Amino acid sequence: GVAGGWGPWGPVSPCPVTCGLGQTMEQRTCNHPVPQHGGPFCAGDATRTHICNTAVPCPVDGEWDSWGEWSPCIRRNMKSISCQEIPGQQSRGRTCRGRKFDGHRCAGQQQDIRHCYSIQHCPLKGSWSEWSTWGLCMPPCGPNPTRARQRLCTPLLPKYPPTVSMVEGQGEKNVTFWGRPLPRCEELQGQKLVVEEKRPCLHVPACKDPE
Protein backbone atom coordinates (compact mmCIF):
# COMPACT_ATOMS: atom_id res chain seq x y z
CA GLY A 1 0.00 0.00 0.00
CA VAL A 2 0.89 3.71 -0.12
CA ALA A 3 1.18 4.10 3.66
CA GLY A 4 4.44 3.31 5.45
CA GLY A 5 4.32 1.64 8.83
CA TRP A 6 7.05 0.13 10.93
CA GLY A 7 7.15 -3.50 11.87
CA PRO A 8 8.19 -4.65 15.35
CA TRP A 9 11.66 -4.05 16.76
CA GLY A 10 13.97 -7.11 16.88
CA PRO A 11 17.64 -8.04 17.60
CA VAL A 12 20.15 -7.72 14.76
CA SER A 13 22.47 -10.40 16.19
CA PRO A 14 22.28 -12.87 19.07
CA CYS A 15 22.61 -11.37 22.52
CA PRO A 16 26.36 -11.22 23.03
CA VAL A 17 26.24 -12.68 26.56
CA THR A 18 25.71 -16.26 27.81
CA CYS A 19 23.73 -15.13 30.87
CA GLY A 20 21.92 -12.14 32.27
CA LEU A 21 21.34 -8.97 30.23
CA GLY A 22 23.59 -7.48 27.55
CA GLN A 23 23.25 -4.70 25.00
CA THR A 24 22.57 -5.39 21.34
CA MET A 25 21.70 -3.41 18.26
CA GLU A 26 18.08 -3.79 17.21
CA GLN A 27 16.32 -3.02 13.97
CA ARG A 28 12.87 -2.80 12.42
CA THR A 29 11.47 -2.97 8.93
CA CYS A 30 9.16 -0.72 6.97
CA ASN A 31 6.73 -3.43 5.96
CA HIS A 32 3.62 -2.96 8.12
CA PRO A 33 2.57 -2.01 5.46
CA VAL A 34 5.23 -1.78 2.74
CA PRO A 35 5.22 1.58 0.89
CA GLN A 36 4.14 1.19 -2.72
CA HIS A 37 3.20 3.45 -5.67
CA GLY A 38 5.05 6.44 -4.25
CA GLY A 39 3.32 6.54 -0.88
CA PRO A 40 5.36 7.88 2.07
CA PHE A 41 8.15 5.82 3.63
CA CYS A 42 8.12 5.11 7.35
CA ALA A 43 9.50 8.03 9.37
CA GLY A 44 12.00 7.43 12.19
CA ASP A 45 15.09 5.40 13.07
CA ALA A 46 15.50 1.92 11.55
CA THR A 47 17.89 0.87 14.35
CA ARG A 48 18.59 1.50 18.06
CA THR A 49 20.76 0.10 20.84
CA HIS A 50 18.73 -1.81 23.38
CA ILE A 51 18.90 -4.28 26.24
CA CYS A 52 18.55 -7.97 25.42
CA ASN A 53 17.65 -10.49 28.13
CA THR A 54 18.90 -14.06 27.98
CA ALA A 55 16.74 -14.92 31.05
CA VAL A 56 19.51 -17.37 32.17
CA PRO A 57 21.15 -16.83 35.60
CA CYS A 58 24.88 -16.36 35.75
CA PRO A 59 27.10 -18.52 37.98
CA VAL A 60 27.42 -17.20 41.50
CA ASP A 61 30.60 -18.08 43.33
CA GLY A 62 30.48 -19.16 46.94
CA GLU A 63 31.97 -16.97 49.62
CA TRP A 64 32.94 -17.85 53.18
CA ASP A 65 30.79 -16.55 55.99
CA SER A 66 32.56 -15.37 59.17
CA TRP A 67 34.31 -17.75 61.54
CA GLY A 68 32.28 -18.99 64.47
CA GLU A 69 33.55 -19.01 68.06
CA TRP A 70 36.44 -21.17 69.23
CA SER A 71 35.37 -24.47 70.83
CA PRO A 72 36.52 -25.12 74.42
CA CYS A 73 40.21 -25.74 74.96
CA ILE A 74 40.46 -29.52 75.59
CA ARG A 75 42.82 -32.49 75.36
CA ARG A 76 41.28 -35.72 74.09
CA ASN A 77 42.83 -38.00 76.73
CA MET A 78 41.86 -35.81 79.75
CA LYS A 79 38.80 -34.54 81.56
CA SER A 80 40.07 -31.05 82.40
CA ILE A 81 43.29 -29.21 81.61
CA SER A 82 42.18 -25.89 83.18
CA CYS A 83 44.70 -24.05 85.32
CA GLN A 84 47.61 -26.37 84.38
CA GLU A 85 50.56 -26.05 82.00
CA ILE A 86 49.02 -28.51 79.52
CA PRO A 87 48.38 -27.51 75.87
CA GLY A 88 45.03 -28.62 74.51
CA GLN A 89 43.41 -27.93 71.08
CA GLN A 90 40.48 -25.83 69.96
CA SER A 91 38.67 -25.19 66.67
CA ARG A 92 36.20 -23.00 64.85
CA GLY A 93 34.43 -23.22 61.51
CA ARG A 94 32.76 -21.30 58.74
CA THR A 95 30.44 -22.10 55.87
CA CYS A 96 30.56 -21.51 52.14
CA ARG A 97 27.47 -19.45 51.26
CA GLY A 98 25.71 -18.35 48.03
CA ARG A 99 27.15 -20.75 45.43
CA LYS A 100 24.65 -21.33 42.68
CA PHE A 101 24.25 -22.04 38.98
CA ASP A 102 27.68 -23.67 38.72
CA GLY A 103 29.63 -20.90 40.46
CA HIS A 104 33.01 -21.74 41.99
CA ARG A 105 33.37 -23.40 45.39
CA CYS A 106 35.06 -21.55 48.24
CA ALA A 107 38.79 -22.13 48.47
CA GLY A 108 40.64 -22.54 51.77
CA GLN A 109 39.99 -24.10 55.16
CA GLN A 110 36.49 -24.74 56.45
CA GLN A 111 37.86 -25.34 59.97
CA ASP A 112 40.68 -23.54 61.87
CA ILE A 113 42.41 -25.42 64.69
CA ARG A 114 44.96 -24.14 67.16
CA HIS A 115 46.71 -25.05 70.39
CA CYS A 116 45.64 -23.36 73.58
CA TYR A 117 46.01 -23.34 77.34
CA SER A 118 42.78 -23.24 79.33
CA ILE A 119 42.42 -20.60 82.03
CA GLN A 120 38.62 -20.98 82.12
CA HIS A 121 37.53 -20.18 85.71
CA CYS A 122 41.14 -20.18 86.95
CA PRO A 123 41.92 -17.91 89.89
CA LEU A 124 44.69 -15.54 88.94
CA LYS A 125 46.21 -12.54 90.68
CA GLY A 126 44.69 -9.36 89.26
CA SER A 127 45.57 -5.66 89.14
CA TRP A 128 43.38 -2.68 88.25
CA SER A 129 43.99 -1.23 84.80
CA GLU A 130 44.07 2.49 84.15
CA TRP A 131 40.98 4.03 82.53
CA SER A 132 40.18 2.88 79.03
CA THR A 133 39.52 5.59 76.49
CA TRP A 134 35.90 6.68 76.24
CA GLY A 135 33.80 4.38 74.03
CA LEU A 136 31.14 5.25 71.46
CA CYS A 137 27.99 7.10 72.44
CA MET A 138 25.22 4.55 72.88
CA PRO A 139 22.49 4.20 71.51
CA PRO A 140 23.84 6.18 68.48
CA CYS A 141 20.38 7.25 67.41
CA GLY A 142 18.23 6.66 70.51
CA PRO A 143 17.29 9.14 73.21
CA ASN A 144 20.03 10.49 75.44
CA PRO A 145 23.25 8.84 74.21
CA THR A 146 25.97 8.18 76.76
CA ARG A 147 29.52 6.94 76.49
CA ALA A 148 31.55 4.94 78.97
CA ARG A 149 35.04 4.13 80.11
CA GLN A 150 36.22 1.42 82.47
CA ARG A 151 38.93 0.22 84.81
CA LEU A 152 39.24 -3.55 84.80
CA CYS A 153 40.67 -6.10 87.19
CA THR A 154 43.23 -7.48 84.72
CA PRO A 155 44.59 -11.02 85.30
CA LEU A 156 48.28 -11.85 85.45
CA LEU A 157 48.64 -14.59 82.83
CA PRO A 158 50.75 -17.57 83.90
CA LYS A 159 54.26 -17.52 82.48
CA TYR A 160 54.03 -20.56 80.19
CA PRO A 161 55.91 -20.84 76.85
CA PRO A 162 54.04 -19.08 74.02
CA THR A 163 55.05 -21.86 71.63
CA VAL A 164 55.41 -25.62 72.10
CA SER A 165 56.66 -28.57 70.02
CA MET A 166 54.09 -31.34 70.34
CA VAL A 167 56.24 -33.84 68.38
CA GLU A 168 59.85 -34.99 68.81
CA GLY A 169 60.43 -33.64 65.32
CA GLN A 170 61.01 -29.92 65.34
CA GLY A 171 58.04 -27.60 64.98
CA GLU A 172 56.95 -24.87 67.42
CA LYS A 173 53.19 -24.24 67.22
CA ASN A 174 51.83 -21.14 68.94
CA VAL A 175 49.79 -21.73 72.11
CA THR A 176 47.17 -19.15 73.09
CA PHE A 177 45.40 -18.61 76.38
CA TRP A 178 41.70 -19.27 76.20
CA GLY A 179 38.81 -18.87 78.64
CA ARG A 180 37.49 -16.37 81.18
CA PRO A 181 39.62 -16.52 84.34
CA LEU A 182 38.67 -15.21 87.81
CA PRO A 183 41.11 -12.36 88.48
CA ARG A 184 41.56 -11.34 92.12
CA CYS A 185 41.89 -7.67 93.11
CA GLU A 186 40.93 -5.79 96.24
CA GLU A 187 37.81 -3.78 95.55
CA LEU A 188 37.89 -0.39 93.84
CA GLN A 189 34.88 1.88 94.36
CA GLY A 190 32.94 -1.07 95.78
CA GLN A 191 33.68 -3.34 92.74
CA LYS A 192 35.84 -6.49 92.34
CA LEU A 193 36.00 -6.67 88.56
CA VAL A 194 34.86 -3.59 86.61
CA VAL A 195 34.44 0.02 87.55
CA GLU A 196 32.67 2.12 84.97
CA GLU A 197 31.94 5.81 84.53
CA LYS A 198 29.57 7.34 82.02
CA ARG A 199 29.13 10.76 80.44
CA PRO A 200 26.34 12.13 78.20
CA CYS A 201 27.25 13.00 74.63
CA LEU A 202 26.39 16.60 73.81
CA HIS A 203 24.57 18.22 70.86
CA VAL A 204 23.86 14.85 69.29
CA PRO A 205 22.98 15.16 65.58
CA ALA A 206 20.02 13.19 64.31
CA CYS A 207 20.47 9.97 62.34
CA LYS A 208 19.17 10.87 58.87
CA ASP A 209 19.77 8.61 55.89
CA PRO A 210 21.52 10.73 53.20
CA GLU A 211 19.99 8.50 50.47
Epitope: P59, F101, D102, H104, R105
Partner: nanobody
Framework: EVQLLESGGGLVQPGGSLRLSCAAS????????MAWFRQAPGKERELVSE???????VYADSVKGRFTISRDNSKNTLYLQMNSLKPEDTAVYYC?????????????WGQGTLVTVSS
Protein backbone atom coordinates in the same frame (compact mmCIF):
# COMPACT_ATOMS: atom_id res chain seq x y z
CA GLU B 1 31.43 -41.44 35.07
CA VAL B 2 34.77 -39.60 35.00
CA GLN B 3 37.97 -41.27 36.24
CA LEU B 4 40.88 -39.23 37.57
CA LEU B 5 44.51 -40.32 38.02
CA GLU B 6 47.02 -37.96 39.70
CA SER B 7 50.82 -38.15 39.82
CA GLY B 8 53.81 -35.96 40.67
CA GLY B 9 54.01 -35.99 44.47
CA GLY B 10 57.32 -36.24 46.27
CA LEU B 11 59.64 -34.79 48.89
CA VAL B 12 60.99 -31.23 48.47
CA GLN B 13 62.75 -28.62 50.59
CA PRO B 14 61.22 -25.23 51.54
CA GLY B 15 61.29 -22.86 48.67
CA GLY B 16 61.24 -25.69 46.10
CA SER B 17 58.70 -26.50 43.41
CA LEU B 18 56.72 -29.51 42.26
CA ARG B 19 54.07 -30.08 39.60
CA LEU B 20 51.09 -32.41 40.07
CA SER B 21 49.29 -33.76 37.01
CA CYS B 22 45.88 -35.41 36.74
CA ALA B 23 44.66 -37.26 33.62
CA ALA B 24 40.90 -37.27 33.25
CA SER B 25 38.94 -39.84 31.28
CA UNK B 26 35.27 -40.73 30.69
CA UNK B 27 32.39 -38.23 30.40
CA UNK B 28 34.69 -35.23 30.61
CA UNK B 29 32.29 -33.02 28.65
CA UNK B 30 29.99 -33.05 31.72
CA UNK B 31 32.60 -31.30 33.89
CA UNK B 32 32.38 -27.60 34.73
CA UNK B 33 35.14 -27.29 37.33
CA MET B 34 38.38 -29.10 37.96
CA ALA B 35 40.16 -28.59 41.26
CA TRP B 36 42.85 -29.61 43.68
CA PHE B 37 42.13 -30.28 47.30
CA ARG B 38 44.55 -31.28 50.02
CA GLN B 39 44.42 -32.99 53.38
CA ALA B 40 47.05 -31.96 55.88
CA PRO B 41 47.84 -33.96 59.04
CA GLY B 42 45.19 -33.32 61.61
CA LYS B 43 42.90 -31.53 59.16
CA GLU B 44 39.89 -31.92 56.97
CA ARG B 45 40.38 -31.92 53.20
CA GLU B 46 40.18 -28.37 51.82
CA LEU B 47 39.96 -26.83 48.35
CA VAL B 48 43.28 -25.37 47.21
CA SER B 49 42.47 -24.20 43.72
CA GLU B 50 39.84 -24.70 41.04
CA UNK B 51 39.39 -23.80 37.41
CA UNK B 52 36.24 -23.59 35.37
CA UNK B 53 35.72 -24.67 31.76
CA UNK B 54 35.64 -21.00 30.75
CA UNK B 55 39.00 -20.51 32.49
CA UNK B 56 38.17 -18.54 35.68
CA UNK B 57 40.07 -19.65 38.79
CA VAL B 58 39.95 -19.33 42.56
CA TYR B 59 42.78 -20.02 44.99
CA ALA B 60 42.96 -20.44 48.77
CA ASP B 61 44.41 -17.37 50.33
CA SER B 62 47.31 -19.42 51.72
CA VAL B 63 48.56 -20.48 48.25
CA LYS B 64 47.62 -17.41 46.16
CA GLY B 65 50.53 -16.23 44.00
CA ARG B 66 52.52 -19.42 44.81
CA PHE B 67 50.42 -22.13 43.20
CA THR B 68 49.03 -22.03 39.63
CA ILE B 69 46.26 -24.31 38.31
CA SER B 70 46.05 -24.98 34.59
CA ARG B 71 44.58 -27.41 32.05
CA ASP B 72 45.89 -28.94 28.82
CA ASN B 73 42.72 -29.75 26.89
CA SER B 74 44.72 -31.39 24.11
CA LYS B 75 45.90 -33.93 26.70
CA ASN B 76 42.77 -33.92 28.96
CA THR B 77 45.15 -33.21 31.87
CA LEU B 78 44.98 -30.81 34.78
CA TYR B 79 48.10 -29.43 36.47
CA LEU B 80 48.97 -27.81 39.81
CA GLN B 81 52.30 -26.00 39.62
CA MET B 82 53.55 -25.30 43.15
CA ASN B 83 56.36 -22.84 43.70
CA SER B 84 57.88 -21.40 46.91
CA LEU B 85 56.71 -24.47 48.83
CA LYS B 86 56.50 -24.21 52.62
CA PRO B 87 56.27 -26.92 55.30
CA GLU B 88 52.65 -26.15 55.86
CA ASP B 89 51.89 -27.25 52.26
CA THR B 90 52.67 -30.85 53.31
CA ALA B 91 49.57 -32.95 52.65
CA VAL B 92 48.02 -35.59 50.41
CA TYR B 93 46.74 -33.70 47.35
CA TYR B 94 43.63 -34.95 45.48
CA CYS B 95 42.45 -34.10 41.84
CA UNK B 96 38.66 -33.39 41.75
CA UNK B 97 36.19 -32.70 38.92
CA UNK B 98 32.63 -31.42 39.43
CA UNK B 99 29.85 -31.82 36.87
CA UNK B 100 27.54 -29.08 35.75
CA UNK B 101 24.32 -29.24 37.71
CA UNK B 102 22.41 -29.91 34.54
CA UNK B 103 24.44 -33.13 34.07
CA UNK B 104 23.89 -34.36 37.62
CA UNK B 105 26.28 -32.35 39.81
CA UNK B 106 28.56 -35.23 40.73
CA UNK B 107 31.99 -34.80 42.29
CA UNK B 108 34.71 -37.24 41.17
CA TRP B 109 37.99 -37.84 42.95
CA GLY B 110 41.50 -39.04 42.27
CA GLN B 111 43.29 -41.37 44.67
CA GLY B 112 45.65 -38.78 46.14
CA THR B 113 49.36 -38.02 45.91
CA LEU B 114 51.67 -37.08 48.78
CA VAL B 115 53.59 -33.83 48.82
CA THR B 116 56.05 -33.46 51.73
CA VAL B 117 57.95 -30.24 52.28
CA SER B 118 60.69 -30.57 54.84
CA SER B 119 64.09 -29.15 55.77
Amino acid sequence: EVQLLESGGGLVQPGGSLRLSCAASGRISSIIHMAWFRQAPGKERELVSEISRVGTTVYADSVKGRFTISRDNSKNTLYLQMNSLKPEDTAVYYCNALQYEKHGGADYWGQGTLVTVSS
